[PDB]
Design a protein around this motif. Structure first.
Motif, PDB file in Angstrom:
ATOM      1  N   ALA A   1       8.786  40.804  23.562  1.00 42.72           N
ATOM      2  CA  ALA A   1       8.589  41.092  22.023  1.00 42.72           C
ATOM      3  C   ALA A   1       7.913  39.972  21.501  1.00 42.72           C
ATOM      4  O   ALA A   1       8.568  38.958  21.489  1.00 42.72           O
TER       5      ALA A   1
ATOM      6  N   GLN B   1      15.313  45.048  17.943  1.00 40.64           N
ATOM      7  CA  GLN B   1      14.966  45.260  19.248  1.00 40.64           C
ATOM      8  C   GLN B   1      16.224  44.980  20.324  1.00 40.64           C
ATOM      9  O   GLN B   1      16.831  43.968  20.308  1.00 40.64           O
TER      10      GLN B   1
ATOM     11  N   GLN C   1      13.324  49.175  17.922  1.00 44.35           N
ATOM     12  CA  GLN C   1      12.752  49.546  19.448  1.00 44.35           C
ATOM     13  C   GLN C   1      13.836  49.375  20.245  1.00 44.35           C
ATOM     14  O   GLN C   1      14.678  48.405  20.209  1.00 44.35           O
TER      15      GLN C   1
ATOM     16  N   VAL D   1      14.204  44.593  25.506  1.00 46.58           N
ATOM     17  CA  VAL D   1      12.712  44.635  25.139  1.00 46.58           C
ATOM     18  C   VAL D   1      12.301  43.410  25.915  1.00 46.58           C
ATOM     19  O   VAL D   1      12.627  42.348  25.812  1.00 46.58           O
TER      20      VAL D   1
ATOM     21  N   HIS E   1      12.900  43.508  12.172  1.00 43.00           N
ATOM     22  CA  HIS E   1      12.641  43.782  13.704  1.00 43.00           C
ATOM     23  C   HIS E   1      14.115  43.897  14.218  1.00 43.00           C
ATOM     24  O   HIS E   1      14.708  42.915  14.310  1.00 43.00           O
TER      25      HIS E   1
END
Lengths: 38, 38, 38, 38, 38, 38, 38, 38, 38, 38
Positions: F21, F15, E15, F18, F13
């Motif tokens: 999160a 990221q 992400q 962000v 994960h």
């Protein structure tokens, strides 16, 4: 001069002996009331 | 001169003997009331 | 001259003998009321 | 001249004999009411 | 002689520039990326 | 002779940039990235 | 002699410039990307 | 000078001995009331 | 001698410039990309 | 000697410039891409 008014309404729920009461957005798993094997 | 008004409404829930009361966004696991094996 | 007003509404819940009362965002685990093996 | 007003509403919960009362954001573990083996 | 095996699977998330990454069980508050008034 | 085995799986994960999160079980407060007034 | 095997599968997510990535079980609050008033 | 007014109406639900009460957006998993094997 | 095997399948998601990516179980609040008043 | 096998299949999603990607179980709130007043 705009006016935006939203109302989600009146919700009354009466439930008895309900296995699954509710809304599922997406279901990919298993929902089984009873599992008997062997 | 805009006016934004949002109301989520009145929610009344009466539930008895309900295994799963609630909303599931996404379900990939297992939801089983009873599991008997062997 | 804007006015932003949000109301989440009135929520009344009456629940008796409910295994799981609540909202699950995402479920990947196991939710079983009863497990009997052997 | 904006006005931001947010209200989360009135929440009343009456619960009796409820195994799990509450909201789970994400569930990857095991939630079992009763486990009997052997 | 029962065998209960549960696996929650392999989850990979990539992400970038994501305001809210995550699962919300229940949301009654306000989630706004940007608020500008006056 | 029952065997109960549970595995929560492998979670990776990645990221970047962000704001939030994580998983929120229940949210009634305010989560705003940026607030500018006046 | 029962065998219970559950697998939640392989989940790969690639997301860029996503305001809200995630599953919401129940939503009664406000989710707005941008708010401009006045 | 526009006026936007939306009302979701009055919903009353009375349910007894209902396995699955609720709306499913998408269903790819298994929903079985009872499973008996062997 | 029963065998219960469940697989939730392989999910691959590629998303770019997506406001809301995710499954909502129930929605009674407001989800607006952009709000401009006055 | 029964065998229960369930597979949720292979799901591949490619999405670009999608306001709302996801499945909604039940919708009583407002989902508006853009709101302009005054």
């Amino acid at each position: 001069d705009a006016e935006f008014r939203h109302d989600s309404g009146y919700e009354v729920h009466h439930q008895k002996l309900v296995f699954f009461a509710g809304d599922v957005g997406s279901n990919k798993g298993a929902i089984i009331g009873l599992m008997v094997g062997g």
